[PDB]
Design an enzyme around this catalytic site. Sequence first.
Site, PDB file in Angstrom:
ATOM      1  N   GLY A 260     -20.821 -45.293  -9.557  1.00 55.02           N
ATOM      2  CA  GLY A 260     -20.093 -44.024  -9.387  1.00 55.02           C
ATOM      3  C   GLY A 260     -20.781 -42.870 -10.089  1.00 55.02           C
ATOM      4  O   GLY A 260     -20.855 -41.790  -9.487  1.00 55.02           O
TER       5      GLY A 260
ATOM      6  N   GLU B  50     -15.935 -22.185   3.134  1.00 56.46           N
ATOM      7  CA  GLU B  50     -14.751 -21.343   2.818  1.00 56.46           C
ATOM      8  C   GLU B  50     -14.080 -21.864   1.541  1.00 56.46           C
ATOM      9  O   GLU B  50     -13.534 -21.038   0.784  1.00 56.46           O
ATOM     10  CB  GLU B  50     -13.785 -21.294   4.003  1.00 56.46           C
ATOM     11  CG  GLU B  50     -12.894 -20.064   3.987  1.00 56.46           C
ATOM     12  CD  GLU B  50     -11.797 -20.038   5.038  1.00 56.46           C
ATOM     13  OE1 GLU B  50     -12.043 -20.520   6.164  1.00 56.46           O
ATOM     14  OE2 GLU B  50     -10.692 -19.551   4.717  1.00 56.46           O
TER      15      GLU B  50
ATOM     16  N   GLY C 204     -21.142 -47.308 -13.525  1.00 55.73           N
ATOM     17  CA  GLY C 204     -22.598 -47.098 -13.443  1.00 55.73           C
ATOM     18  C   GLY C 204     -23.033 -46.658 -12.050  1.00 55.73           C
ATOM     19  O   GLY C 204     -23.927 -45.810 -11.969  1.00 55.73           O
TER      20      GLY C 204
ATOM     21  N   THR D  60     -12.448 -49.348 -17.056  1.00 54.52           N
ATOM     22  CA  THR D  60     -13.297 -50.547 -16.865  1.00 54.52           C
ATOM     23  C   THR D  60     -14.086 -50.795 -18.152  1.00 54.52           C
ATOM     24  O   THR D  60     -13.921 -51.898 -18.692  1.00 54.52           O
ATOM     25  CB  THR D  60     -14.137 -50.406 -15.595  1.00 54.52           C
ATOM     26  OG1 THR D  60     -13.199 -50.452 -14.520  1.00 54.52           O
ATOM     27  CG2 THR D  60     -15.185 -51.484 -15.450  1.00 54.52           C
TER      28      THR D  60
HETATM   29  N1  LIG Z   1      -8.043 -44.272  -9.103  1.00 50.80           N
HETATM   30  C1  LIG Z   1      -8.927 -45.280  -9.114  1.00 50.80           C
HETATM   31  N2  LIG Z   1      -9.793 -45.406 -10.117  1.00 50.80           N
HETATM   32  C2  LIG Z   1     -10.601 -46.481  -9.965  1.00 50.80           C
HETATM   33  C3  LIG Z   1     -10.614 -47.392  -8.934  1.00 50.80           C
HETATM   34  N3  LIG Z   1     -11.585 -48.355  -9.151  1.00 50.80           N
HETATM   35  C4  LIG Z   1     -12.126 -48.012 -10.300  1.00 50.80           C
HETATM   36  N4  LIG Z   1     -11.582 -46.878 -10.845  1.00 50.80           N
HETATM   37  C5  LIG Z   1     -11.969 -46.212 -12.085  1.00 50.80           C
HETATM   38  O1  LIG Z   1     -13.357 -45.996 -12.035  1.00 50.80           O
HETATM   39  C6  LIG Z   1     -13.963 -46.288 -13.319  1.00 50.80           C
HETATM   40  C7  LIG Z   1     -14.819 -47.528 -13.178  1.00 50.80           C
HETATM   41  O2  LIG Z   1     -15.800 -47.331 -12.143  1.00 50.80           O
HETATM   42  P1  LIG Z   1     -15.874 -48.225 -10.820  1.00 50.80           P
HETATM   43  O3  LIG Z   1     -15.706 -47.357  -9.618  1.00 50.80           O
HETATM   44  O4  LIG Z   1     -15.001 -49.424 -10.892  1.00 50.80           O
HETATM   45  O5  LIG Z   1     -17.421 -48.684 -10.921  1.00 50.80           O
HETATM   46  P2  LIG Z   1     -18.609 -48.783  -9.851  1.00 50.80           P
HETATM   47  O6  LIG Z   1     -18.943 -47.422  -9.366  1.00 50.80           O
HETATM   48  O7  LIG Z   1     -18.273 -49.840  -8.864  1.00 50.80           O
HETATM   49  O8  LIG Z   1     -19.807 -49.203 -10.823  1.00 50.80           O
HETATM   50  P3  LIG Z   1     -20.381 -50.607 -11.406  1.00 50.80           P
HETATM   51  O9  LIG Z   1     -19.398 -51.661 -10.975  1.00 50.80           O
HETATM   52  O10 LIG Z   1     -20.394 -50.286 -12.895  1.00 50.80           O
HETATM   53  O11 LIG Z   1     -21.724 -50.848 -10.809  1.00 50.80           O
HETATM   54  C8  LIG Z   1     -12.773 -46.411 -14.275  1.00 50.80           C
HETATM   55  O12 LIG Z   1     -12.386 -45.155 -14.798  1.00 50.80           O
HETATM   56  C9  LIG Z   1     -11.701 -46.994 -13.361  1.00 50.80           C
HETATM   57  O13 LIG Z   1     -10.411 -46.749 -13.864  1.00 50.80           O
HETATM   58  C10 LIG Z   1      -9.703 -47.243  -7.861  1.00 50.80           C
HETATM   59  O14 LIG Z   1      -9.577 -47.944  -6.839  1.00 50.80           O
HETATM   60  N5  LIG Z   1      -8.886 -46.131  -8.048  1.00 50.80           N
HETATM   61  C1  LIG Z   2     -10.989 -59.027 -21.719  1.00 51.32           C
HETATM   62  O1  LIG Z   2     -11.928 -60.049 -21.506  1.00 51.32           O
HETATM   63  C2  LIG Z   2     -13.265 -59.743 -21.189  1.00 51.32           C
HETATM   64  C3  LIG Z   2     -13.834 -58.466 -21.195  1.00 51.32           C
HETATM   65  C4  LIG Z   2     -15.166 -58.323 -20.859  1.00 51.32           C
HETATM   66  C5  LIG Z   2     -15.897 -56.973 -20.830  1.00 51.32           C
HETATM   67  C6  LIG Z   2     -15.779 -56.439 -19.445  1.00 51.32           C
HETATM   68  C7  LIG Z   2     -16.107 -57.301 -18.256  1.00 51.32           C
HETATM   69  N1  LIG Z   2     -16.321 -57.918 -17.336  1.00 51.32           N
HETATM   70  C8  LIG Z   2     -15.117 -55.142 -19.173  1.00 51.32           C
HETATM   71  N2  LIG Z   2     -15.391 -54.501 -17.913  1.00 51.32           N
HETATM   72  O2  LIG Z   2     -14.981 -54.248 -20.226  1.00 51.32           O
HETATM   73  C9  LIG Z   2     -14.930 -54.743 -21.567  1.00 51.32           C
HETATM   74  C10 LIG Z   2     -15.343 -56.014 -21.918  1.00 51.32           C
HETATM   75  C11 LIG Z   2     -15.256 -56.394 -23.262  1.00 51.32           C
HETATM   76  C12 LIG Z   2     -14.758 -55.498 -24.220  1.00 51.32           C
HETATM   77  C13 LIG Z   2     -14.334 -54.208 -23.837  1.00 51.32           C
HETATM   78  N3  LIG Z   2     -13.807 -53.270 -24.806  1.00 51.32           N
HETATM   79  C14 LIG Z   2     -14.425 -53.850 -22.505  1.00 51.32           C
HETATM   80  N4  LIG Z   2     -14.015 -52.542 -22.056  1.00 51.32           N
HETATM   81  C15 LIG Z   2     -15.929 -59.415 -20.522  1.00 51.32           C
HETATM   82  C16 LIG Z   2     -15.385 -60.678 -20.518  1.00 51.32           C
HETATM   83 BR1  LIG Z   2     -16.479 -62.238 -20.021  1.00 51.32          BR
HETATM   84  C17 LIG Z   2     -14.055 -60.804 -20.853  1.00 51.32           C
HETATM   85  O3  LIG Z   2     -13.481 -62.044 -20.864  1.00 51.32           O
HETATM   86  C18 LIG Z   2     -14.008 -62.898 -21.835  1.00 51.32           C
END
Ligand SMILES: Nc1nc2c(ncn2[C@@H]2O[C@H](COP(=O)(O)OP(=O)(O)OP(=O)(O)O)[C@@H](O)[C@H]2O)c(=O)[nH]1
Ligand SMILES: COc1cc([C@H]2C(C#N)=C(N)Oc3c2ccc(N)c3N)cc(Br)c1OC
Lengths: 424, 437, 309, 53
Positions: B146, B254, B144, B179
């Site tokens: 990013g 460039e 969100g 994530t």
């Molecule tokens: N290569 C790489 N991808 C990352 C890294 N951290 C997060 N990602 C990727 O970035 C996406 C998730 O966004 P994040 O950067 O964690 O989120 P944020 O911008 O902190 O946003 P919020 O936590 O949602 O407020 C996913 O596709 C992750 O796999 C990192 O250190 N390296």
């Molecule tokens: C795996 O256990 C949990 C997952 C989540 C919730 C979450 C967070 N924090 C993340 N980032 O993503 C998901 C999450 C849940 C379902 C899906 N499919 C996704 N991708 C929250 C909690 Br609390 C979790 O442990 C119970």
Amino acid sequence: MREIVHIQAGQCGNQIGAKFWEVISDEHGIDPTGSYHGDSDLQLERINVYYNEATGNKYVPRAILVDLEPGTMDSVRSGPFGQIFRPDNFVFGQSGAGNNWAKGHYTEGAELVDSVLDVVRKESESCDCLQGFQLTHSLGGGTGSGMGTLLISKIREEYPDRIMNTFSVMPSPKVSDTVVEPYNATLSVHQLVENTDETYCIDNEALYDICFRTLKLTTPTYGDLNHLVSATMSGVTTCLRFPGQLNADLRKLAVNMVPFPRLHFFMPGFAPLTSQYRALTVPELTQQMFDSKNMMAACDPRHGRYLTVAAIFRGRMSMKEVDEQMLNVQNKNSSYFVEWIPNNVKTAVCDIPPRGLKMSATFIGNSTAIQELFKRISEQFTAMFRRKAFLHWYTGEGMDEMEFTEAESNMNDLVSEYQQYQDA
Amino acid sequence: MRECISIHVGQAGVQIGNACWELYCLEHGIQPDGQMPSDKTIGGGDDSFNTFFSETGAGKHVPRAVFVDLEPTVIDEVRTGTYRQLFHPEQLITGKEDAANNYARGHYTIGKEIIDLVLDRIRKLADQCTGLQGFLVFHSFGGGTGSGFTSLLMERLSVDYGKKSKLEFSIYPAPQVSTAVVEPYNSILTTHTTLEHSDCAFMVDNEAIYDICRRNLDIERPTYTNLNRLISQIVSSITASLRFDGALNVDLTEFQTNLVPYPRIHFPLATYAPVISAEKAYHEQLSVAEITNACFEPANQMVKCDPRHGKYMACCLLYRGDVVPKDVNAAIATIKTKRSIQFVDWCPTGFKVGINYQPPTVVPGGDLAKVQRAVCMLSNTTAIAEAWARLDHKFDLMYAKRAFVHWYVGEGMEEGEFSEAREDMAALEKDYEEVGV
Amino acid sequence: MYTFVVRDENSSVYAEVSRLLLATGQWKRLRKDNPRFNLMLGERNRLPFGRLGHEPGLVQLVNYYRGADKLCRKASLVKLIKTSPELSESCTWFPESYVIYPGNVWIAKSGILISSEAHVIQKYLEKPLLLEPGHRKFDIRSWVLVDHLYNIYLYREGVLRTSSEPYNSANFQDKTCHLTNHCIQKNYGRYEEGNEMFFEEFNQYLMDALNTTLENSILLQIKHIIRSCLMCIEPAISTKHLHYQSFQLFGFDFMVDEELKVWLIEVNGAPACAQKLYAELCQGIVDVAISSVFPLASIFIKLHHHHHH
Amino acid sequence: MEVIELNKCTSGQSFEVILKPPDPSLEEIQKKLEAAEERRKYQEAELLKHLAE
Ligand SMILES: Nc1nc2c(ncn2[C@@H]2O[C@H](COP(=O)(O)OP(=O)(O)OP(=O)(O)O)[C@@H](O)[C@H]2O)c(=O)[nH]1
Ligand SMILES: COc1cc([C@H]2C(C#N)=C(N)Oc3c2ccc(N)c3N)cc(Br)c1OC
Ligand SMILES: Nc1ncnc2c1ncn2[C@@H]1O[C@H](COP(=O)(O)OP(=O)(O)CP(=O)(O)O)[C@@H](O)[C@H]1O
Ligand SMILES: Nc1nc2c(ncn2[C@@H]2O[C@H](COP(=O)(O)OP(=O)(O)O)[C@@H](O)[C@H]2O)c(=O)[nH]1
Ligand SMILES: [Ca+2]
Ligand SMILES: [Mg+2]
Ligand SMILES: [Mg+2]
């Protein structure tokens, strides 16, 4: 996004609520006086989520304890961890609710709700970043059901922008207090469809069946049912409570699990089902937490499709082996996931195992098969309501039939909405 | 010389930021305290490396960096970590509540209440520049923050710096290291809203990097740390020309001229070789021929796609180490015959070559072995459109059912912004096909 | 249990490949838009190759080689043979063909104009080979299966698609003696069944009327032309080192002239197997192209020839 | 294959090789950021109105 406020309302609320504080306190190494005596630092890095730090380096649950009758709350104080709770956070009436939703929500409960909110407000004020509330209650009685939902309504008015999470115990004729349980549960679901972000459906039918069938206990007690409930509650809160690499919270739980605001009723699961010596293998954990026999809600997940899924493995294991096993069911049982939410299964791993077990899995499923639970309560409701049977207990507290028709309709609506997405 | 400001947004932005600045410091001989012994001009300089580092009287070398995260836990590890003395606290900006993987919440809600502050810390850095070029912006498509906060900054930078170049390093979402379920939604929305505001965007598919770390570094389960150390090598290859003596890609303008003739089609494919395990006991060092050839193997690309099924608009070869031009031409001759390298009729079939004789720097105790020579290819190929199609299809399966939309609308965002963002992306896919067939 | 999807209805050949696959007990078919397949049996047009090979925990195969269209359209085949060093402008086994966009007898095609007056114009074979008794024309169709390692498999059974009318010199407009399709010919079945002579009988006619065998007179040239064509485009279409894998069944169309020279007419990207043979070929596809990549619980001649120079 | 514009220095060299020849304003941004807070405040009004009932 750090502090959670825990509310436990009524007999069932305060009973499962008590177990949860016994279980996590022991995981975070807190003792029956509130003093830390653990070993790992992991046990304290996110202790703030569920505990306030007080004078002398004591840990005080952010727990409020509600009941319209003094009984069960004197039992919590008497009980093994009863001394840990802030005494100003016990709030109780005298006359009880007598399994009457109307009394919980509208008469007896109204008088008491304001003084609970004051304790809530007090806990909310000294919170660096409140994520929201988790309530433990049954839907089958008067206080947990009727007053619990009144509290939820009033917390939402005062905190529209915080997350509301429930552990909601559904009633079963297999564990029946009274004939009016379907009434109190249907009125309570209407409240939960409108005013919660996430609800864990703890089905007493499921807990019973797991105890009888798949645990060979001929006469299950509330102690036996609650053992399964406290394991599930420990499981589904693991990532809120421990670092790390997920670092989960209740909003992110909500955003990721709930694709439609009303469809937020979760089918929890647990493996291995206990009352061992051999630790389970990652494939066993995986097969078992996706098995019907392991769900805490009496629904056939083969009658539905998974919208979203969250799984948390606890113990020491290869994440590679967890990944492989979690992709194996997804790629060999794709029919029972929706094709229209890509990558809908999310897995997490925590190195600290629960007390006793070496490795455990916890399942959280947003499955359309939850409809079977609501349909079952609807049918128990209709069988009485079509002869207006036992209504006088509710009309005598000022409720109209209309409000029963409305709650009947909103629950049949919720069932259709789950149906819609099973065939899409 | 002309200064460049690096903005790291979100967890991905920030952790990739840390890896880059770790590598830059090793490459330039700057220590964690920020002292540069080899630097003889104290309190100043118009040296190439000064484009990326400012200087203080006490002789500290300070990144021209802003780190922004809506929550504090990740930039807190920068504040408390190995390179804490390097950065000025005013450069490390954190809120409290993160965007919970919600574009709308990063852009509209929690965005609007922190943009004016970030712009101000950005402006303090611009005010220490003699001749500011523009900005390098590191972020995920998937978070969100990013997605949503990045697209808001790029609008306000366009208004406050109309003359200045904006380059992106974008992390494209991959189910293997993911994530949130709503990354597709966040990815399309931030592309639509950033398209007209970005001059050149370097996309890294987390899938491609993860696999390169599985295949070539023998890491069973790669971590963001493994991914980021590899990404920071590719980023360093791309920015070397800004930080060292040379004549190719010397200023941000460039990059656009050399890599982006058609301005909407501004996502150059990065290809990198060689990636060699440091654990690997016995390694026969690859030649110029072997590493140039590796640039046309999809398995070494920052995005998995087929350059054989699409057309080139530009190709830059950036060599590091023991490389001379005759070996580069010999290699290009061999490969022209053996491969399908179709360009567009209105472009010269041509390679722009840059060589820097210093081999890649590796992080000590890193995963990447020291090599005698390495290369990064920047091809603007229509084949990258494959990554847009994959992402757009995922958006369509979820949007068809309006799944999770209510999370965005609940922040003041309208349903229509979704169809709008998706139509823009449908147009970009068509732009790539006219040009590509 | 492996998984597959179907996105080609009209496909008689992958109708049967689908059927054989189901009736095995280790292969579940999924819905056409379900992304978690092992095998895709994909559409003729606009097949979305960009989507393949990105699903974690899944090795993905598809029954088409991306860019094999260049060998299958008339417009691009001609251009491919004229602009490839490995098949030169002076290539011996392709009838002189030209591209102008909308004995000196020619033919145009993509309604088929054969005159000297008047898409691709092509040198028409005034003196072709005729089956007696008949004084009548035919064309030979070979089924070729290229697997994921780019092994080239010829199926030992082909078939002739015969005319039933004396071929004519002065009479061009008439279309049942000049053009030897199957659809235009349905004297239908007077000499042989469905206008379909097979390899055993055609090996015999040749032995009796022409003293040679099918192997020597015709099949050596077929195996050279199939090999030349698919090794030309191997650099462009090969999925070796790619993140998904391809196979494809091709149908090659040939003509034999009077002095027993084998010409190439068309290469067919989505070919129809002859009625009798479906059973054997579709089981082969599965054995070689599919079970090789997805192992369970020879009808092909493999084409390879490394001459050292 | 012709090697053009060769430049050398002590850190490296660069050259080109050819095989063959051939934004809205501050106003409009603060406008739509506010239109979405007005939609966000309305939604929260509608919620309080409904909770009053
Ligand atoms: N290569 C790489 N991808 C990352 C890294 N951290 C997060 N990602 C990727 O970035 C996406 C998730 O966004 P994040 O950067 O964690 O989120 P944020 O911008 O902190 O946003 P919020 O936590 O949602 O407020 C996913 O596709 C992750 O796999 C990192 O250190 N390296
Ligand atoms: C795996 O256990 C949990 C997952 C989540 C919730 C979450 C967070 N924090 C993340 N980032 O993503 C998901 C999450 C849940 C379902 C899906 N499919 C996704 N991708 C929250 C909690 Br609390 C979790 O442990 C119970
Ligand atoms: N140069 C040539 N000389 C003689 N006959 C030719 C010819 N070109 C085409 N033909 C005849 O016309 C027919 C050509 O069919 P063509 O290959 O053009 O289209 P098609 O749609 O039938 C492909 P397929 O048969 O594989 O399905 C053949 O039977 C062949 O005898
Ligand atoms: N699982 C479980 N269910 C309970 C427990 N106590 C009561 N119940 C169930 O809760 C419902 C009765 O509600 P109760 O909490 O006692 O009513 P209240 O105290 O007036 O809110 C019935 O469905 C009971 O079977 C308990 O400790 N565990
Ligand atoms: Ca200096
Ligand atoms: Mg009771
Ligand atoms: Mg974040």
